[PDB]
Amino acid sequence: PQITLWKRPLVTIRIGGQLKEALLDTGADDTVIEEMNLPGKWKPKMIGGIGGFIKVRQYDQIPVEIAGHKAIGTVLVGPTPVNIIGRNLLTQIGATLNF
Amino acid sequence: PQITLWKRPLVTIRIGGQLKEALLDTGADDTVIEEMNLPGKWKPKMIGGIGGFIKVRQYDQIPVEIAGHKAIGTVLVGPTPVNIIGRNLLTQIGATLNF
Ligand SMILES: CC[C@H](C)[C@@H]1NC(=O)[C@@H](NC[C@@H](O)C[C@@H](Cc2ccccc2)C(=O)N[C@H]2c3ccccc3C[C@H]2O)Cc2ccc(cc2)OCCCCCNC1=O
Structure with missing residues (x-):
């Protein structure tokens, strides 16, 4: 899916x-x-x-399923303000920045 | 352009x-x-x-020009280890996440 950054x-x-x-x-x-x-x-x-x-x-x-897409990688658990999906898993689901 | 997230x-x-x-x-x-x-x-x-x-x-x-894309908005200056272009300016250049 294409996700805009207004939110x-x-x-x-x-x-x-x-x-x-x-x-x-x-x-x-x-x-x-x-x-x-x-x-x-x-x-x-x-x-x-x-x-x-x-x-x-x-x-x-x-194993982590992101918006219906499967990825299997390293996940860090700790005192974070919000759950964050970083580049290690973003590359697995083929996410790219476009403009 | 299309930016991959390997790096x-x-x-x-x-x-x-x-x-x-x-x-x-x-x-x-x-x-x-x-x-x-x-x-x-x-x-x-x-x-x-x-x-x-x-x-x-x-x-x-x-005024901040991002890769030839003219944008203008709020910029925070501080002791950051790296320059960060946030959503306030990314929305202005029509940037999206795709996967
Ligand atoms: C620069 C980021 C600004 C200050 C902040 N966003 C973040 O910190 C958000 N992520 C910030 C990163 O994108 C910035 C990014 C900047 C950077 C880059 C390279 C080297 C050093 C620092 C970073 O920290 N990166 C680090 C990181 C984060 C998570 C896991 C591993 C690592 C390693 C490193 O890359 C998460 C967040 C936190 C609090 C939140 C909402 C979201 O509270 C709610 C919103 C609070 C007010 C708004 N704050 C934000 O949007």
């Missing part, structure tokens, strides 16, 4: 059997979801953005 | 007579430019991102 590009995703709303973020290298219980082993990690660095739990090969 | 979506912009490299960010509500001496009156502001908040100076009606 925040928030879409419904499905992860861990749960449906959530996430922001399609082209400025985020990785995908960071709000604290939740995800199956499997996780590795402590530190990511940085605007405002500072935060500690996250890194999960690998996590 | 960070960096483009050349023109602001205040200077050519800069900025990141096309669909996850940013506003546009944040690295510290530069822009003339005119500004309003102090605090924007929140991933690791917290940072203080910026808000300039309005600033």
